[model samples]
Structure formats: structure tokens, C-alpha cells
Target: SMEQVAMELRLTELTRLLRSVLDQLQDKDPARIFAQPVSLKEVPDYLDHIKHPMDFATMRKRLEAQGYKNLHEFEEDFDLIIDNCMKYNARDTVFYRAAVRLRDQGGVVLRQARREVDSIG
Candidate 1:
């Protein structure tokens, strides 16, 4: 469903931008914003290697719009997006609240794939 896609992308963008920020600062890394996996180590690879439901360019647009040019602002957005997604369908239990914030909300051992199908008008 579009909702799930949207949620995935929401989390996707959060991890993508945040990890990108972390990569730059490294040691003197700004304070942790999202309740993420605790290590900047795995988060970047996870955010990058995982299936990208949304592209960086598209995701960056949202970030840019929010005036989130700094760590402080980024932290604020991360919290809200994480909380909002978990509250809806994606459960916090599955996604770790902070591991990319980690866990699937829909609760499916296996998710069925969707494809375009011809429909009668």
C-alpha cells in the first residue's frame, strides 16, 4: 500500500540524511538525535544497502525544505518522523525505535509483492 511505502520512505530519508551527516563529522559527531542503533558504524551501510523505496534526490528535497541544515534541526525532525511512523502501522517493536530507528510495523513474516495489473473500468 501507498501508506507503507510512504512510511518506509519516511524512515528511509531520516536514516539517509542522518547517516550522511554522521559520516562527515565522525568523532566529534554531534549529539545523537534519532534513538538509532547507537553506533554510527552499521547505520550508514544499512541505510544505503537497504532497498531504497525513495531516491536520494527526492529525499533530499524534503530535508532541504525543512531548513534542516544543521545537526540540531536534523535531530528534531528525526524524532518526529520516527514517532509518527511507529504510531501508525509500523510497530516500534520490530524497528528498534532507533536502529535506522529498526523494525517493521505491519508485522509480516513475509510480505507479498505488488505489481501493476490491468483492471476493467
Candidate 2:
């Protein structure tokens, strides 16, 4: 029973840290567009360019599913969101610039969380 408690407690702490990173990311995006998945209805060519689409809404679903094994898995999805944006939007466009800013800000946030959770793991 004590060992189970320890396991559950660690997961709780890990998930908490993961959620916190996403929360900061959502707030960091000035347009707040990253909070939701890109609407395929509007951006019809999105999937044509991006094989793997990752967004805040999708991350929440995965988090709720507890699909991530650790911080590394979570970071991959987070990075994909920015990468997809940069890939599809030109550097001169607003979408691409916004993604650049988010990448800079979100990078620090994730680094901080990684440090915080390293001890927990």
C-alpha cells in the first residue's frame, strides 16, 4: 500500500508539472491561437503540409488520457506545435513570427519545469 501511494504521488507531481508548462505556453502566445488546434476548415492545406499536428487542445486530451510516459514525450508534442507552424507559414507572416516568440518563451518555461520535476523522478 505504501509503495502504491508513492507511485501515485510521483505521477501526480509529474502531471502537475506537465500541466503547468502547457498553461504557461497558452498564456505566452500573444494571439492565444495556440490554445486550440488549427481549424482544418479554415486552413484547408494544413494537413497537406503537417503530417503530425500538435496543439494545446490535443495536448490536454493526451494529458487527460495519461498517454505521456514522461516529460520528454510531452516536450516532443509541444515542439511539434511550433515546428508545424514554422513549416507552414512564411517567415514574413504573422503566424510564423508568433510561433518564433512562443518558441523562445515556451523554451524557458519547459526548462524550468524540467528542472523542477527532475528531483521528483
Candidate 3:
């Protein structure tokens, strides 16, 4: 039985959570995302290539759920939370600090360039 085990982790609940969280961000923070670069209609399309990502549709749904019925409104809301910043104080822990830092690879190349002083005749 142990040999037959296979594992897969899915985001069903996570999506549900985000559906709510995005709904909370429901405000768009209340602004637009990338209007200067792309026309307002193009915003939702940008969601597909989003990397390091969340399913942007939750944000889309959240926006729609919260009554941002169109891209204009959704993008407006997107802007508020877009180009925005957040900061938090994180305490540095000394215990995990390594006395010596490490490098995965070390390399050196020696090549001579011929010029007048070391000219090739």
C-alpha cells in the first residue's frame, strides 16, 4: 500500500480563500493597472502571462463580485492596489547566520590580449 501512494497538492481551498481576499482588495485598492502602457481593455489579457502568480481571475471575480462590472472599473480598482507599496519590520535572527557565506561555483579565467606591449608579430 505504501508503494502505491502518490501525492498531489491542489489549490481548491486556496483559490476560495483568495477569492475572498481579492474580494477584500475588492477596492482595486480602487484605481487601474498599466493604463499608461496598455489600453484599458488590455488589462485583463495581461493576467494570463502573470508569473510567480495567483489565478488573476479571483481578482477578476472579486472585482466583479464587488460590483466593478467592467474592465474600466476593474482596472480602476486594480490601479489602487497596483504600483502600491508595503513595508513591515522583520527581526533578523542571529542563530541561522552562517559565519562563512558560500558560493555554488568559483571560476577564474586567464587570457592574454595582445597589444603593442605584448604584441603578436
Candidate 4:
């Protein structure tokens, strides 16, 4: 196959992989707080702590818009979403614990996707 065809295939693969990761994360979250972007009004001074806020909804929209260039870009956003919560919430809080779980879960999903891509001819 030509480089152009391969590039197209890789892009589609990334889209599907990221889509699966988001769906799985959504399914695993019990509180569903990460389903949408955090509200500045609901939590005052949130921006003071997290400068780059991210959420599942925004990620999904970006994926549809083909915003991510590759797997690394998608993974960066995925980790950022989890890390933002962990940074904002105290370690003792449920939000911190939930972010931890989501991080681990996302790790597994990413690893599996990498393996799948590696084995492809």
C-alpha cells in the first residue's frame, strides 16, 4: 500500500482506539462527573488550580473533528483529563480515587490498543 493509504488507515485506527477508550472510561465511572466539562460556577476557583481543563465530551468532539494527529496526542488528552481531577481534588477525596482508577483503566486500554496495532501486518 502507498504511504497515503497507510496513513489513512492509521488515522482511522487511532479514532476507533480512542473512541473505545472513552466509552470504556465512561462505563467505568460511577459518579459520571467526567462525562462533561467541569463547571467554573459550580466549583469556584477551579481554573486557578487547573489551567487546562478537559472532559469526555470535549474529547469526543475533538475526535469527531479529527483533532488528534496520532495515538500519542489522543493519549495525552486522555491522561490530562484524569490528571486534572487528581490535581484539583485532595488525595483523601473520592474524586482523587476515581481519577486513579480511571488512569489505570486507561492505561490498560492503551496498552491493548498498542499491541493490536503492533501485530497488524
Q: Say which candidate scores most in TM-score.
A: 2
**Residue 4 of model 4, lDDT score:** 91
Off by over 4 Å in 1: 1-19, 22-59, 62-66, 90-121
TM-score of each: 0.28, 0.89, 0.25, 0.84
Sort by TM-score, top down from the best: 2, 4, 1, 3
Clashing pairs in 2: none
Q: What does candidate 3's lDDT look like per residue over 1-121, in tens digits?
A: 5433321112233334334434444332223221123323745554343322222353555543444332344334443332221111112422112101100010000011112112421
Number of clashing pairs per prediction, in order: 9, 0, 7, 0
User: How far in Å is the alpha carbon of 111 misplaced in model 3?
Assistant: 53
Candidate 3 runs further than 4 Å off = 1-10, 28-81, 84-121
Error of 1 at 16 (Å): 13
Per residue, candidate 2 scores C-alpha lDDT tens digits across 3-83 of 989887777777777887778888888687677888989989888899999889999889876677789999999899899
Model 2 has how many clashing residue pairs?
0
Model 2, residue 74: distance off in Å is: 0.8
- Please give the ranking of all candidate structures by lDDT, highest first, separated by commas: 2, 4, 1, 3
Residues 1-121 of candidate 4 have per-residue lDDT tens digits of 6999988888877777768767877777778878899987898888889989998899899998777877778778888888899888899998889888888877787788677656752
Candidate 2: segments with Cα more than 4 A from true spot: 1-5
